[PDB]
Design a protein around this nucleic acid. Sequence first.
RNA 1: GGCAGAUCUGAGCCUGGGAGCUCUCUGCC
Length: 14
Amino acid sequence: RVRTRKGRRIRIXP
RNA sequence: GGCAGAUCUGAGCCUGGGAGCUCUCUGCC
């Protein structure tokens, strides 16, 4: 998964 | 119990523009 935590791009498994 | 969401607007991780790991709020069954 794609997300964004504190205005940066973070991957959360797929 | 299980499920589904979650950001410079859920907290940490010394590699981190991020395939991994801890933990938790709210709704749903």
